[PDB]
Design an enzyme around this catalytic site. Structure first.
Site, PDB file in Angstrom:
ATOM      1  N   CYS C  41       0.625  -1.066   0.067  1.00 19.71           N
ATOM      2  CA  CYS C  41       0.059   0.072   0.146  1.00 19.71           C
ATOM      3  C   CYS C  41       0.883   1.273  -0.067  1.00 19.71           C
ATOM      4  N   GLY C 173      -7.656  -6.704 -17.142  1.00 15.29           N
ATOM      5  CA  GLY C 173      -8.396  -6.803 -15.724  1.00 15.29           C
ATOM      6  C   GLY C 173      -9.158  -5.581 -15.568  1.00 15.29           C
ATOM      7  N   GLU C 196     -11.769  -7.086 -19.897  1.00 12.10           N
ATOM      8  CA  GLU C 196     -12.457  -7.651 -18.562  1.00 12.10           C
ATOM      9  C   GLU C 196     -13.406  -8.828 -19.114  1.00 12.10           C
ATOM     10  N   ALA C 263      -3.266  -7.043 -14.481  1.00 19.49           N
ATOM     11  CA  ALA C 263      -3.765  -6.811 -13.395  1.00 19.49           C
ATOM     12  C   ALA C 263      -4.998  -7.617 -13.026  1.00 19.49           C
ATOM     13  N   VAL C 264      -4.814  -8.939 -13.125  1.00 17.33           N
ATOM     14  CA  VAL C 264      -6.002  -9.704 -12.720  1.00 17.33           C
ATOM     15  C   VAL C 264      -6.143 -10.249 -11.334  1.00 17.33           C
ATOM     16  N   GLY C 265      -5.255  -9.717 -10.703  1.00 15.76           N
ATOM     17  CA  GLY C 265      -5.569 -10.374  -9.158  1.00 15.76           C
ATOM     18  C   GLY C 265      -4.089 -10.370  -8.542  1.00 15.76           C
ATOM     19  N   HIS C 437     -25.429  22.011   2.423  1.00 15.43           N
ATOM     20  CA  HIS C 437     -25.839  22.379   0.872  1.00 15.43           C
ATOM     21  C   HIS C 437     -24.898  23.815   0.652  1.00 15.43           C
TER      22      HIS C 437
HETATM   23  C1  LIG Z   1     -22.083  35.143  -0.257  1.00 13.31           C
HETATM   24  C2  LIG Z   1     -22.794  34.080   0.347  1.00 13.31           C
HETATM   25  C3  LIG Z   1     -22.483  32.914   0.600  1.00 13.31           C
HETATM   26  C4  LIG Z   1     -23.220  31.779   1.098  1.00 13.31           C
HETATM   27  N1  LIG Z   1     -22.889  30.787   1.106  1.00 13.31           N
HETATM   28  C5  LIG Z   1     -23.546  29.670   1.981  1.00 13.31           C
HETATM   29  C6  LIG Z   1     -23.119  28.088   1.664  1.00 13.31           C
HETATM   30  O1  LIG Z   1     -22.185  27.676   0.930  1.00 13.31           O
HETATM   31  N2  LIG Z   1     -24.219  27.265   2.243  1.00 13.31           N
HETATM   32  C7  LIG Z   1     -25.254  27.631   2.809  1.00 13.31           C
HETATM   33  O2  LIG Z   1     -25.807  26.693   3.458  1.00 13.31           O
HETATM   34  N3  LIG Z   1     -25.363  28.842   2.849  1.00 13.31           N
HETATM   35  C8  LIG Z   1     -24.784  29.991   2.347  1.00 13.31           C
HETATM   36  N4  LIG Z   1     -25.261  31.183   2.309  1.00 13.31           N
HETATM   37  C9  LIG Z   1     -26.408  31.538   3.063  1.00 13.31           C
HETATM   38  C10 LIG Z   1     -27.717  30.905   2.175  1.00 13.31           C
HETATM   39  O3  LIG Z   1     -27.719  31.483   0.955  1.00 13.31           O
HETATM   40  C11 LIG Z   1     -29.191  31.232   2.766  1.00 13.31           C
HETATM   41  O4  LIG Z   1     -29.209  30.629   4.198  1.00 13.31           O
HETATM   42  C12 LIG Z   1     -30.451  30.548   2.015  1.00 13.31           C
HETATM   43  O5  LIG Z   1     -30.297  31.159   0.601  1.00 13.31           O
HETATM   44  C13 LIG Z   1     -31.693  30.944   2.796  1.00 13.31           C
HETATM   45  O6  LIG Z   1     -32.784  30.429   2.226  1.00 13.31           O
HETATM   46  P1  LIG Z   1     -33.999  31.077   2.012  1.00 13.31           P
HETATM   47  O7  LIG Z   1     -35.050  30.316   1.147  1.00 13.31           O
HETATM   48  O8  LIG Z   1     -34.597  31.366   3.419  1.00 13.31           O
HETATM   49  O9  LIG Z   1     -33.943  32.520   1.730  1.00 13.31           O
HETATM   50  P2  LIG Z   1     -33.589  33.194   0.215  1.00 13.31           P
HETATM   51  O10 LIG Z   1     -32.930  32.244  -0.484  1.00 13.31           O
HETATM   52  O11 LIG Z   1     -33.268  34.616   0.602  1.00 13.31           O
HETATM   53  O12 LIG Z   1     -34.701  33.278  -0.569  1.00 13.31           O
HETATM   54  C14 LIG Z   1     -35.830  34.140  -0.135  1.00 13.31           C
HETATM   55  C15 LIG Z   1     -36.480  34.257  -1.684  1.00 13.31           C
HETATM   56  O13 LIG Z   1     -38.022  35.114  -1.271  1.00 13.31           O
HETATM   57  C16 LIG Z   1     -37.997  36.344  -2.348  1.00 13.31           C
HETATM   58  N5  LIG Z   1     -38.810  37.194  -1.454  1.00 13.31           N
HETATM   59  C17 LIG Z   1     -38.646  37.990  -0.535  1.00 13.31           C
HETATM   60  N6  LIG Z   1     -39.395  38.843   0.063  1.00 13.31           N
HETATM   61  C18 LIG Z   1     -40.602  38.595  -0.972  1.00 13.31           C
HETATM   62  C19 LIG Z   1     -42.018  38.950  -1.017  1.00 13.31           C
HETATM   63  N7  LIG Z   1     -42.393  39.842  -0.079  1.00 13.31           N
HETATM   64  N8  LIG Z   1     -42.570  38.655  -2.045  1.00 13.31           N
HETATM   65  C20 LIG Z   1     -41.966  37.719  -2.860  1.00 13.31           C
HETATM   66  N9  LIG Z   1     -40.838  37.016  -2.982  1.00 13.31           N
HETATM   67  C21 LIG Z   1     -40.152  37.605  -1.859  1.00 13.31           C
HETATM   68  C22 LIG Z   1     -36.549  36.588  -2.308  1.00 13.31           C
HETATM   69  O14 LIG Z   1     -36.489  37.519  -3.540  1.00 13.31           O
HETATM   70  C23 LIG Z   1     -35.758  35.376  -2.586  1.00 13.31           C
HETATM   71  O15 LIG Z   1     -35.724  34.809  -3.799  1.00 13.31           O
HETATM   72  C24 LIG Z   1     -24.531  32.174   1.724  1.00 13.31           C
HETATM   73  C25 LIG Z   1     -24.869  33.727   1.649  1.00 13.31           C
HETATM   74  C26 LIG Z   1     -24.065  34.650   1.129  1.00 13.31           C
HETATM   75  C27 LIG Z   1     -24.707  36.019   0.967  1.00 13.31           C
HETATM   76  C1  LIG Z   2      -1.484  -0.779  -7.679  1.00 12.97           C
HETATM   77  C2  LIG Z   2      -2.211  -1.010  -6.370  1.00 12.97           C
HETATM   78  C3  LIG Z   2      -3.038  -0.217  -5.970  1.00 12.97           C
HETATM   79  C4  LIG Z   2      -3.931  -0.406  -4.592  1.00 12.97           C
HETATM   80  N1  LIG Z   2      -4.680   0.764  -4.309  1.00 12.97           N
HETATM   81  C5  LIG Z   2      -5.450   0.510  -2.891  1.00 12.97           C
HETATM   82  C6  LIG Z   2      -6.290   1.437  -2.649  1.00 12.97           C
HETATM   83  O1  LIG Z   2      -6.245   2.546  -2.872  1.00 12.97           O
HETATM   84  N2  LIG Z   2      -6.912   1.142  -1.365  1.00 12.97           N
HETATM   85  C7  LIG Z   2      -6.938   0.087  -0.891  1.00 12.97           C
HETATM   86  O2  LIG Z   2      -7.552  -0.471   0.138  1.00 12.97           O
HETATM   87  N3  LIG Z   2      -6.045  -1.304  -1.177  1.00 12.97           N
HETATM   88  C8  LIG Z   2      -5.254  -0.821  -2.394  1.00 12.97           C
HETATM   89  N4  LIG Z   2      -4.494  -1.720  -2.875  1.00 12.97           N
HETATM   90  C9  LIG Z   2      -4.389  -3.199  -2.103  1.00 12.97           C
HETATM   91  C10 LIG Z   2      -3.668  -2.811  -0.951  1.00 12.97           C
HETATM   92  O3  LIG Z   2      -2.374  -2.524  -1.342  1.00 12.97           O
HETATM   93  C11 LIG Z   2      -3.252  -4.056   0.231  1.00 12.97           C
HETATM   94  O4  LIG Z   2      -4.812  -4.546   0.476  1.00 12.97           O
HETATM   95  C12 LIG Z   2      -2.618  -3.662   1.408  1.00 12.97           C
HETATM   96  O5  LIG Z   2      -1.381  -3.313   1.018  1.00 12.97           O
HETATM   97  C13 LIG Z   2      -2.895  -5.155   2.241  1.00 12.97           C
HETATM   98  O6  LIG Z   2      -1.668  -4.905   3.506  1.00 12.97           O
HETATM   99  P1  LIG Z   2      -0.904  -6.114   3.995  1.00 12.97           P
HETATM  100  O7  LIG Z   2      -0.586  -5.531   5.551  1.00 12.97           O
HETATM  101  O8  LIG Z   2      -1.894  -7.343   4.328  1.00 12.97           O
HETATM  102  O9  LIG Z   2       0.071  -6.490   3.178  1.00 12.97           O
HETATM  103  P2  LIG Z   2       1.286  -6.209   2.134  1.00 12.97           P
HETATM  104  O10 LIG Z   2       1.124  -4.631   2.283  1.00 12.97           O
HETATM  105  O11 LIG Z   2       1.680  -6.402   1.339  1.00 12.97           O
HETATM  106  O12 LIG Z   2       2.448  -6.067   3.401  1.00 12.97           O
HETATM  107  C14 LIG Z   2       3.019  -7.369   3.757  1.00 12.97           C
HETATM  108  C15 LIG Z   2       4.574  -6.833   4.072  1.00 12.97           C
HETATM  109  O13 LIG Z   2       5.135  -8.134   4.702  1.00 12.97           O
HETATM  110  C16 LIG Z   2       6.691  -8.316   3.864  1.00 12.97           C
HETATM  111  N5  LIG Z   2       6.832  -9.601   4.154  1.00 12.97           N
HETATM  112  C17 LIG Z   2       6.117 -10.690   3.211  1.00 12.97           C
HETATM  113  N6  LIG Z   2       6.653 -11.875   3.754  1.00 12.97           N
HETATM  114  C18 LIG Z   2       7.529 -11.596   4.555  1.00 12.97           C
HETATM  115  C19 LIG Z   2       8.427 -12.722   5.333  1.00 12.97           C
HETATM  116  N7  LIG Z   2       8.360 -14.072   5.168  1.00 12.97           N
HETATM  117  N8  LIG Z   2       9.453 -12.093   6.160  1.00 12.97           N
HETATM  118  C20 LIG Z   2       9.385 -10.692   6.258  1.00 12.97           C
HETATM  119  N9  LIG Z   2       8.578  -9.914   5.801  1.00 12.97           N
HETATM  120  C21 LIG Z   2       7.747 -10.268   4.987  1.00 12.97           C
HETATM  121  C22 LIG Z   2       6.519  -7.390   2.625  1.00 12.97           C
HETATM  122  O14 LIG Z   2       7.446  -7.177   2.355  1.00 12.97           O
HETATM  123  C23 LIG Z   2       5.519  -6.396   3.173  1.00 12.97           C
HETATM  124  O15 LIG Z   2       5.965  -5.231   3.433  1.00 12.97           O
HETATM  125  C24 LIG Z   2      -3.676  -1.667  -4.080  1.00 12.97           C
HETATM  126  C25 LIG Z   2      -2.840  -2.649  -4.521  1.00 12.97           C
HETATM  127  C26 LIG Z   2      -2.218  -2.418  -5.889  1.00 12.97           C
HETATM  128  C27 LIG Z   2      -0.878  -3.414  -6.226  1.00 12.97           C
END
Ligand SMILES: Cc1cc2nc3c(=O)[nH]c(=O)nc-3n(C[C@H](O)[C@H](O)[C@H](O)COP(=O)(O)OP(=O)(O)OC[C@H]3O[C@@H](n4cnc5c(N)ncnc54)[C@H](O)[C@@H]3O)c2cc1C
Ligand SMILES: Cc1cc2nc3c(=O)[nH]c(=O)nc-3n(C[C@H](O)[C@H](O)[C@H](O)COP(=O)(O)OP(=O)(O)OC[C@H]3O[C@@H](n4cnc5c(N)ncnc54)[C@H](O)[C@@H]3O)c2cc1C
Lengths: 39, 460, 460
Positions: C41, C173, C196, C263-265, C437
């Site tokens: 790994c 594979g 495959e 890469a068959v296993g 969101h």
């Molecule tokens: C720059 C910025 C970034 C933000 N980023 C995030 C974020 O990443 N994640 C997050 O969760 N929150 C974020 N927020 C806050 C999020 O946008 C607000 O919590 C969310 O939009 C509130 O939903 P709401 O439906 O209550 O109100 P609003 O989305 O404000 O919608 C109210 C709607 O009612 C309309 N309306 C109002 N009064 C009247 C009326 N009298 N008659 C008819 N229509 C009317 C408005 O025009 C509007 O379309 C961010 C805010 C800002 C300013």
């Molecule tokens: C290209 C590739 C990508 C992979 N990507 C992922 C991934 O993203 N996520 C995931 O979960 N798995 C992935 N795997 C599988 C993952 O690598 C293995 O499941 C994991 O390494 C198994 O851990 P292990 O401790 O059992 O064995 P290993 O990591 O193989 O370790 C065994 C160790 O024992 C040593 N050893 C062996 N025999 C002896 C001995 N007789 N005496 C002393 N030392 C010894 C070896 O040298 C080695 O260091 C991938 C495998 C490959 C080939």
């Protein structure tokens, strides 16, 4: 606390979770706990 | 003729989710939109901001890429970038309109105002319904001494990067908006100074992970000044002379910049909506008072999203819309979910659940587990391991309380944490889930192991 | 005769996890390694391949980037790329060495061979212990008619892209290794054809999502031939003339390439290990027979990872090492977890749980939910969707049975699915978890909504 689904089911069935003693793992309230209390 | 079971005011994330779910449950819906369909998130919020962030990150990462043999002289055309941004927005907003129509929802364009408990007026015409869902969103909050203008931008204006990048930009507000737009401008070549009144950025989140994000931004050259507030400014020939001052006040300081971005918050759009004619109660901050069912003080009238209460997040508004629609349809749904928050800067920041302070306040025996990305094999294969995962739990029950992440894909990894909390997972549950190797998600599993003092890839 | 509480043979993912965990539990451990610390790994598997894939994706993405104003004339230095790959590998293997020593584990370099139930011989010296953990891993499996040589490569040779890219490559594979290396070579400039034997690539996973990955690869110019097997080849002046035939045998066809990647296993490294001198039972394929405790036919002797049983995955080996270590330490642990599988191609493929067929065979009333990336706002902001999420569950109990994902970050999102299965989540639990969101993770939430015919962003 209880899972969302259980809390929601309790409201639906008119069951007050604070009056119940869960029979689940560590006192966890189960769905059947809620249904049992409901009727 | 034409009657409705439900009228939804606003087609933002909350509104269009409410309209669609209501339609799925068999209600005849009328959705009213005063501006662009899709609301803030799709038009001038989430979407355009995330698109700009992606372009900037693509350009930025090429520096690290030179390290593995990818040589090029990248040049980012702002006009072309703006066009793509516009394309993404139009594609999605058009998609919302298509979904509304596909669900049988009637879309009315205009500004709706209530004139009674169950009656709305739009363009001089009256419409009534047994149920009304208020989803009017919010707008940029104005800051005292910095009225929006040609030199003082709100987030909407800041999105138009193709309209001339300022040499020097001052961002007021260390929230998700200021940090994201701040990094975009910095990566596009602008000098950026960001001020935050509070002691740390993202004051509502974990200070430890938030601090790591700040440090990362400072490394990129963004001068971040916490415990600092903007008092005012005066336009001069060479630029805007902004006066900075400690949060508590005192030593006055001046910084010279070309433009100011004010991102200190939002204001719910609840004024001039006719709430006072319908009997709908609004709190001091302007939010429509609602209970867990999203119901207002008036039976049959619900409020969701930004207009109902913070956090002002999209996924929250979407869920609240579903709850309101379901309740309007006669069901009994309540909002009692964990709401995660994400900052799409690079590295990303994400959090859900309780911070150490909040957990303590709630009476838990707080204990934490931490795993640094520097120990992540996946992070290294991505050209850089910068970040960390912190899990907050109760020492006595082993129950998971909160998760905070700083690093690449943090926003995607937080979903696992949200589910964990919803399912009432313990730290043992999190650690026992077999996470794929190599992946960034492994950091959650290992942070849990660390909570139990037995992490493998780091000394305990 | 030097003795220890435990002797671990192999320092790959499984071995070093076993060594470290046992050490954390108070045991005196000796770890033996015949080659490079860190195993396949870290040295010739997961790590170098993921590194190459990240470089390839970075280069590839620039084509889409031109769409948003990023102008560049990329030139990839293969020697520099190989250098970075070697750099990443060295950092991680050296890291494992520091973890072993930091935990008090004794490292002995050499080839260990058992001479008895509890005795090992290394370099002519004898070592004994109360418990032994066999973590020898595997090696590339040879294919009849394609002996490894100058023109027939195994995965290790394929990693050395700096030794000249062939104009035409044939990959045998359709598993994770073949697909990933096939795409690396394609993106680096080579013509690539992959064959495959089975009806579809990734025969162990969901056919539908696997098919989407195949079509995506085909769109990039990679010719994928399913239901086809390689029988042999003839080296001529114009290249290698490889003979292909239908899986079930039949009319032969030919394809001409410059190099061939087999890469068959994998073949477990259990021969010449002294197993026949210790009484350790091995199955027909070479895998050391073990139970849920990772115990072999000999008390006190455990086997983990690739040497013990498929699937041949790293995270699996790691968890197995922890289980074997814990039991060697006196605990009562057992392996009974959901093991996800990930393919790091672009788009990525990921799966955990039961496929539609397996669920049906298991006796469940199978029902599915599907959500396309085309309806994802996040996918659009990242340059354009391309994928889908498919959830498999029981229509009667609503229990989640399996999850398959194809798209960017699929590998990171599957952990949430793994957690869901471990926690016994239902489709409703997943649908009711508030995913941030906008994020790719939302696709899992909406697929769950779709399962109940109420997805919002797609017509049901
Ligand atoms: C720059 C910025 C970034 C933000 N980023 C995030 C974020 O990443 N994640 C997050 O969760 N929150 C974020 N927020 C806050 C999020 O946008 C607000 O919590 C969310 O939009 C509130 O939903 P709401 O439906 O209550 O109100 P609003 O989305 O404000 O919608 C109210 C709607 O009612 C309309 N309306 C109002 N009064 C009247 C009326 N009298 N008659 C008819 N229509 C009317 C408005 O025009 C509007 O379309 C961010 C805010 C800002 C300013
Ligand atoms: C290209 C590739 C990508 C992979 N990507 C992922 C991934 O993203 N996520 C995931 O979960 N798995 C992935 N795997 C599988 C993952 O690598 C293995 O499941 C994991 O390494 C198994 O851990 P292990 O401790 O059992 O064995 P290993 O990591 O193989 O370790 C065994 C160790 O024992 C040593 N050893 C062996 N025999 C002896 C001995 N007789 N005496 C002393 N030392 C010894 C070896 O040298 C080695 O260091 C991938 C495998 C490959 C080939």
């Amino acid at each position: 606390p209880a899972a969302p689904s259980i809390r929601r089911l309790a409201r639906e069935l008119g069951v007050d979770l604070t009056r119940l003693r869960g029979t689940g793992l560590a006192g966890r309230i189960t769905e059947e706990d809620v249904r049992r209390a409901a009727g | 003729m034409k009657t409705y079971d439900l009228i939804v005011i606003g087609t933002g994330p909350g509104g269009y989710h409410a309209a669609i779910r209501a339609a799925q449950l068999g209600l005849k819906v009328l959705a009213v939109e005063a501006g662009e369909v899709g609301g803030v998130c799709l038009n001038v919020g989430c979407i355009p901001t995330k698109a700009l962030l992606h372009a900037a990150e693509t350009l930025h990462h090429l520096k690290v890429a030179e390290g593995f043999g990818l040589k090029a002289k990248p040049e980012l055309d702002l006009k072309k970038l703006g066009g793509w941004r516009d394309q993404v927005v139009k594609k999605l907003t058009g998609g919302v309109g298509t979904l509304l129509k596909g669900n049988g929802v009637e879309l009315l364009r205009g500004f709706a105002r209530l004139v009674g408990p169950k009656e709305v007026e739009v363009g001089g015409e009256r419409y009534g319904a047994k149920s009304l869902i208020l989803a009017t969103g919010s707008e940029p909050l104005e800051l005292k001494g910095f009225p929006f203008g040609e030199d003082v931008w709100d987030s909407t204006r800041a999105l138009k990067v193709e309209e001339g990048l300022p040499k020097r930009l001052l961002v007021i507000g260390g929230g998700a908006v200021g940090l994201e737009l701040g990094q975009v401008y910095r990566r596009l070549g602008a000098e950026v100074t960001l001020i935050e009144y509070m002691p740390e950025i993202l004051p509502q989140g974990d200070p430890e992970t938030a601090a790591l994000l700040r440090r990362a931004l400072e490394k990129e050259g963004i001068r971040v000044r916490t415990k600092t507030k903007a008092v005012g400014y005066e336009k001069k020939k060479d630029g805007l002379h902004v006066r900075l001052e400690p949060a508590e006040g005192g030593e006055g300081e001046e910084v010279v910049v070309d433009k100011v971005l004010v991102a200190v918050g939002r204001k719910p759009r609840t004024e001039g909506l006719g709430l006072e004619k319908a009997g709908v109660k609004v709190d001091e901050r302007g939010f429509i008072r609602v209970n867990a069912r999203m119901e207002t003080s008036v039976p049959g009238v619900y409020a969701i999203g930004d207009a109902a209460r913070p956090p002002l997040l999209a996924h929250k508004a979407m869920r609240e819309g579903l709850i309101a629609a379901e309740n309007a349809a006669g069901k009994d749904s309540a909002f009692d979910y964990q709401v995660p928050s994400v900052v799409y800067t690079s590295p990303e920041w994400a959090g859900v659940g309780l911070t150490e302070e909040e957990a303590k306040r709630a009476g838990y025996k707080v204990k934490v587990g931490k795993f640094p990305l520097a120990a992540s094999g996946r992070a290294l294969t991505l050209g850089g391991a910068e970040g960390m995962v912190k899990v907050v739990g109760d020492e006595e029950t082993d129950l998971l309380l909160g998760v905070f992440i700083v690093g690449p894909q943090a926003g995607e990894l937080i979903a696992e944490a949200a589910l964990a909390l919803e399912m009432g997972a313990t730290l043992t549950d999190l650690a026992l889930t077999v996470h794929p190797h190599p992946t960034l998600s492994e950091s959650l599993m290992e942070a849990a192991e660390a909570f139990h003092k037995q992490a493998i890839h780091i000394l305990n």
